Amino acid sequence: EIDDALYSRQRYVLGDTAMQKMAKSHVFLSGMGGLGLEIAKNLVLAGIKAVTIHDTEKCQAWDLGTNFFLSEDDVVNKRNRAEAVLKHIAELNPYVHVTSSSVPFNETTDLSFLDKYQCVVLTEMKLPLQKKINDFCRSQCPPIKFISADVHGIWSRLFCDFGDEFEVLDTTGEEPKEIFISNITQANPGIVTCLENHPHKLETGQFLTFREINGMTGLNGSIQQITVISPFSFSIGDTTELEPYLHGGIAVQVKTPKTVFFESLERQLKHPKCLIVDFSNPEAPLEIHTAMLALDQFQEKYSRKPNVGCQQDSEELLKLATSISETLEEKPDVNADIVHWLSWTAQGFLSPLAAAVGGVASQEVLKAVTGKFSPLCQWLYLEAADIVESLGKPECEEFLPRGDRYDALRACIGDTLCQKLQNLNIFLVGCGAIGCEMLKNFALLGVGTSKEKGMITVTDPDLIEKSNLNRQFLFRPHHIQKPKSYTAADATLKINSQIKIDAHLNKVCPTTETIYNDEFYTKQDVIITALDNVEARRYVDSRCLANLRPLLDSGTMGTKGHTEVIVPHLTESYNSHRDPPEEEIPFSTLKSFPAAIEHTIQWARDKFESSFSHKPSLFNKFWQTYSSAEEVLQKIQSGHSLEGCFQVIKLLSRRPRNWSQCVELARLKFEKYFNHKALQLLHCFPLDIRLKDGSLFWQSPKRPPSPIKFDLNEPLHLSFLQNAAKLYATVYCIPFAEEDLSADALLNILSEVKIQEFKPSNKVVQTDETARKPDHVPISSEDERNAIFQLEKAILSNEATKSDLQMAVLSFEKDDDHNGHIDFITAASNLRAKMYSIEPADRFKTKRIAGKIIPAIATTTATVSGLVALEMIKVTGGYPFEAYKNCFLNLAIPIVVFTETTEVRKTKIRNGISFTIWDRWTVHGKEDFTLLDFINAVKEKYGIEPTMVVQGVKMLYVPVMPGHAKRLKLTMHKLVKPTTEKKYVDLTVSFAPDIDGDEDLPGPPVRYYFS
Ligand SMILES: O=P(O)(O)O[C@H]1[C@H](OP(=O)(O)O)[C@@H](OP(=O)(O)O)[C@H](OP(=O)(O)O)[C@@H](OP(=O)(O)O)[C@H]1OP(=O)(O)O
Ligand SMILES: Nc1ncnc2c1ncn2[C@@H]1O[C@H](COP(=O)(O)OP(=O)(O)OP(=O)(O)O)[C@@H](O)[C@H]1O
């Protein structure tokens, strides 16, 4: 099977079929350089059955700056690189059988041994050898998937070749869409109309299936190719021979296999299918490909890479590139700058770019071994020329190696920028999947390793769980239930002994703002967020905007990822970007009229919360507010009203006393949820009732419920009964054993249970989507008397003791599979689904939807971490606006889009006065300084007269209010009454617009000093 506790988050990304295909697959990886190590790490974290790492190079001091598993002892002993890293790699995932190899590769090497590997990845291999290996691999039956990846300084090359014909079983991996049908016309071709404000969002040529269609019963169960006509309509083909449309209908998107044609590596070198990553330079990938091919030819010709600063070598490389360009089909122009920089940084190696390319290549390997997504076709050329482009023309002496571990990075970015990196003060927020990779990149780049000023602060309150080991490679199984930051710091210190780190456990929130005051942010140079929610992102961005400090943001949703770069005085902040809010499920839809499995899952989750967390909390709070039941009864008899008293009384009268009573209560709850509710709803609205227009009320998207008869033999009913009984026993503190969960024991208990007869009641049911949950309806006197009688009976029965007035409150924990929370939610959701004839969902989908688990995989995390590290380098260098690039990537397509970061927008108020979001105004005063003096000072310093003073919720001054015109004479200390904690106070000021009737135009925040 599949270890769900470890692969829970990856299971949603890939699927159990892809997971089973990931086993039984043997992957051969060669080179074990900086890039090969990243690829191997990502693959082992993914969970491939067996990986064979192979290398022949001996470890060197230069390798320490690129390999995060090597140590100085390995260099001393001159061990093989694969042998040295084999022990560490295997510990990442014990399920993976990792083996090392050292068989030499050359012209005469026999390639017969590669037939046992599904996929082959080659790094740091000579080009003719790659050609021969690819030719052998693609000619096998079945073809062996070939992937080649290389990194030379700041330039990278990625290649894929999955045989002549590769069968993709899933083009995108998105959830199939469901489109509700409004009306279908009998025509050749017929036209299908969707419901209003429900765009189908479909593409011409896709195949759809139909069900629950009245009139055209033939269309049910059939598959038709469609042509898009309008956002709410499309054509499916001839429908004249069918019966006229009545009502109803659901169309479901159908996924089909797709065939992708690749080509041999030898032929691809002349007509490359490069993937465009920057639409502003569509022809850049072709030029980069030409330059790298010229570099390979230079290596073949001279047996060495070009020397940095040797003009003759650069001229020779340019000549070779010019010669190569003519042989290309398109004959593109040779980019002198790209060739020159490739010559300059040929011998270097950039760690973040290596990590990004490793993530992409690992995703491609997974595509090769599973067919889950559309593979790359065929070349991907990532580059980081922006890092050195802003440097202009530096001297060669800044790039010469100096013997330390940072020679690889120095040969790329020069000594000056390396020194600037070592003195950074980085405040890294959150230490999740992205945080660990960012720490690894920091250790590789030497960030904060200086003994003078460098310092890294990482803060995180969570604890390590088993499911986190799949993505966060810095953690180990023995680290479970330990702080994330401490473990990450301990591991990073192992990676680079010189690094300075300072872990924290505080959660970044306004409650902890005292620790992370303004001075602390002033000390920091770069702030990086690895958060998973939105509110924390907005809070951190607001703090950074207040303190004028650059912020880097990133996030991953499965194969999707995005990076955002925020720079003071240059780019818009995160708060300036506002997405539409979350999709609120209508209250009427959730409560009474579900239409999809998501609605039932949400209803089950809310029912669980209300039954086991909210209601017990109310019960405990009520019984702690008052002494005992006698006092409450006396108050009620005197006419006193208490909040939620009747509900508490009802709960007390139904408290189970033993396991049998708990089972009976679960049975009654089942009957109420899935038998009485449907009958009540049908009684309120019969199946054949119609509206004023004559249309059936029970039409799409509403679905008519049907009662469910209890049956212990049904596995679903038994599962629900068991889970409900266990949860109720836990809440009411009733001991039980597994024998009590047996079907026979439950049947014996249920033999004596009498089922109360259902009786319909007159209740108002909200049907409009705009309706929401109303407040508490006042309770009639008869219900009050019933509650009084029940409470008196409980008191007289001596069942109101202290033990009876307390009951434990459960917390919804989803990762713990033995508590039965997810089992109960799944049982309730499926049972409700059968009530409304909705398709049931399995346990894992319910766990994902109810728990709001965000799918995530290691490869996307590594890629976004590498890109964020590149942007951090750019920020540290203080480069101009054009250098920074926001990134959005979706490896499922695959697609990578680099775009310029959003330019800061200037907002004008009056007389040409303009301000940015980064601007903050300062005012100084004294004790007798009045509001009129404040207005005069503002109009003097900035030329604009204030007309609106706000401090949060405080209403300070408006000239138009009838009675507050006198406030101009009031001093600040009396107008706002500020706290004495600080010497200044922040205010929000607006000015009257040039056109009357409009609200005063808000201005930049203004900080007023009391002295
Ligand atoms: O408190 P809620 O989570 O909103 O659930 C309540 C509650 O049902 P449970 O106690 O079974 O969870 C009501 O029962 P009381 O505790 O008030 O007796 C029940 O009312 P009825 O038993 O009278 O049907 C009502 O259902 P409704 O609003 O349809 O009357 C139902 O609400 P939901 O199940 O829709 O949440
Ligand atoms: N306000 C905050 N301050 C500090 N750390 C935060 C804050 N909000 C979230 N975090 C951290 O963000 C991290 C997010 O990590 P990640 O995205 O890998 O998921 P996770 O929390 O480990 O779990 P899962 O992926 O299962 O939801 C968590 O470790 C959490 O501690």
Distance (angstroms) between ligand 1 centre and the Cα of 752 equals 25
Nearest CA among 885, 869, 901 for reference residue 435: 869
Kindly tell me the burial class for residue 104, based on how many C-beta atoms sit within 10 Å of its own C-beta (0-12, 13-18, 19 or more). Answer: exposed
Q: Specify whether the CB–CB gap between 227 and 195 falls below 8 A.
A: no
**Are 426 and 528 contacting, i.e. CB atoms less than 8 angstroms apart?**
yes
CB burial readout 559-573, b (16+ within 10 A) else e: bbbbbbbbbbebbbb
Going from the Cα of 859 to the center of ligand 2, the distance in angstroms, rounded, reads: 18
Q: How far is the CA of 672 from the centre of ligand 1 (A)?
A: 9
What 3-state DSSP class applies to 604?
Answer: helix
CA 769 to ligand 1 center in whole angstroms: 20
Q: Which of 565, 659, 647 is nearest to 877 (CA)?
A: 565
Q: Are strands 1006-1009 and 921-924 parallel, antiparallel or unpaired?
A: parallel
Residue 326: C-alpha distances to residues 294, 322, 329, 337 (Å): 12, 7, 8, 18
Gap between the Cα atoms of 358 and 109, Å rounded: 27
Give the closest residue (by CA) to ligand 1 atom 4.
610
Burial class (CB in 10 A: 0-12, 13-18, 19+), 782: exposed
Strand locations in 839-919, DSSP E? Answer: 885-890, 895-900, 907-908, 914-915
Cα 425 to middle of ligand 2, angstroms? 22
C-beta of 430 in contact with ligand 2 (< 6 A): yes
Say which ligand is closest to the CA of 678: 1
Q: Which letter does DSSP use for residue 509 in this model?
A: S
| Residue type at 732 in one-letter notation | Y
Ligand 2 pocket residue status of 436, Cβ below 6 Å: no
Angstrom distances, CA of residue 115 to CA of 26, 27, 364, 384, 923: 10, 11, 20, 37, 76
Alpha-carbon gap, residue 972 to 850, rounded angstroms? 51
Those residues with Cβ within 8 angstroms of residue 996's Cβ, 6 or more apart along the chain or in another chain: none
Pocket (CB within 6 angstroms of ligand 1) = 591, 607, 610-611, 669, 672, 763
Query: What atom in ligand 2 is closest to the CA of residue 509?
Result: 1
CA 659–ligand 1 middle distance (angstroms) = 23
Q: Report the residue among 532, 538, 853 best suited for mutation to probe ligand 2: largest number of ligand atoms under 8 A from its CB.
A: 532
- Strands 425-429, 455-459: parallel, antiparallel or unpaired by DSSP? parallel
857 Cβ inside 6 Å of ligand 2:
no
Amino acid at 81: R
Our answer on whether the CB atom of 484 is closer than 6 Å to any ligand 2 atom is: yes
Query: Taking the CA atoms of the chain, what radius of gyration do you get in angstroms?
Result: 34
Structure tokens at 928: 């007798």
| CA of residue 458 to ligand 2 center, whole Å | 12
Residue whose token pair is 């350089």: 33
Atom of ligand 1 nearest to the CA of 680: 29
**Ligand 2 atom closest to Cα of residue 433:** 18
Ligand 1 centroid to residue 788 C-alpha, Å: 20
512, two tokens:
């902890």
- Indicate the SS3 state at residue 463: strand
Angle between helices 81-90 and 34-46 (to 10 degrees): 30
Looking at 548-614, list the stretches that DSSP marks H as alpha helix, in order from N- to C-terminal side.
587-591, 597-609
Other Cβ atoms less than 10 A from the Cβ of 511: the count is 9
Atom of ligand 1 nearest to the CA of 606: 3
CB of residue 550 inside a 6 A radius of ligand 2 = no
Ligand 2 lined by 536 (C-beta under 6 Å): yes
Those residues whose C-beta lies under 8 Å from the C-beta of residue 458, and which sit 6 or more positions away, are 428, 431, 435, 439, 485, 488, 489, 501, 502, 503, 504
805 CA → ligand 1 middle, Å: 22
> With 0-12 CB in 10 A as exposed, 13-18 as middle and 19+ as buried, what is 381?
buried
Q: What are residue 139's DSSP bridge partners?
A: none
Nearest to 48 by CA among 125, 108, 140, 121: 121
Residue 439 alpha carbon to ligand 2 centre in Å? 15
Ligand 2 pocket, residue 461 CB under 6 Å: yes
- Where the chain is discontinuous (C–N > 2.5 Å), the residues before each break are none
Determination technique used: cryo-EM
Helices and strands (DSSP H and E) totals, the chain: 32, 33
Of 211, 199, 205, the closest CA to residue 227 belongs to 205
- State the distance from the centre of ligand 2 to the C-alpha of 464, rounded, in angstroms: 10
- Residue type present at position 237: G
Note the ligand closest to the C-alpha atom of 594.
1
Q: Does ligand 2 lie within 6 Å of residue 814's CB atom?
A: no
Nearest ligand for residue 509 CA: 2
Q: What is the DSSP letter of 768?
A: S
Interval between CA 816 and ligand 1 midpoint (Å): 28
Which alpha helices (DSSP H) does 474-625 contain, by range?
Answer: 484-495, 518-523, 535-547, 587-591, 597-609, 615-625
Minimum-distance ligand to the CA of 483?
A: 2
Which residues, in sequence order, are bridge partners of residue 223? Answer: 209
Q: Is 361 exposed, middle or buried (0-12, 13-18, 19+ CB in 10 A)?
A: buried
Which amino acid appears at position 774 of this protein? Answer: P
Beta bridge partners of 528: 428, 552
* Nearest CA residue ID for atom 11, ligand 2: 430
Ligand nearest to the CA of 515: 2
Is the beta carbon of 538 within 6 A of some atom in ligand 2?
no
- Output the CA 530–ligand 2 centroid distance in Å: 8
Q: Is the peptide bond before 285 cis (omega within 30 degrees of 0)?
A: no
The bound ligand whose nearest atom lies closest to the alpha carbon of 651 is 1
Nearest ligand 2 atom, CA 472? 18
Distance, in Å, from the CA atom of 287 to the CA atom of 318, rounded to the nearest integer, reads: 12
**Residue 529: closest CA among 865, 853, 854, 856:** 865
Q: How far is residue 432's CA from residue 427's CA, in Å, rounded to a whole number?
A: 14
509 lines ligand 2 (CB under 6 A): yes
CA angle 883, 886, 892 (to 5 degrees): 135
Contact 820, 736 (CB under 8 A): no
Q: How many CA atoms lie within 13 A of 536 on its CB side?
A: 17
Q: What is the DSSP string of 770-832?
A: T-----PPPPPHHHHHHHHHHHHHHHHTT--STGGG--PPP---SS-TTS-HHHHHHHHHHHH
Evaluate whether 508 touches 540 at the Cβ level (below 8 Å).
yes
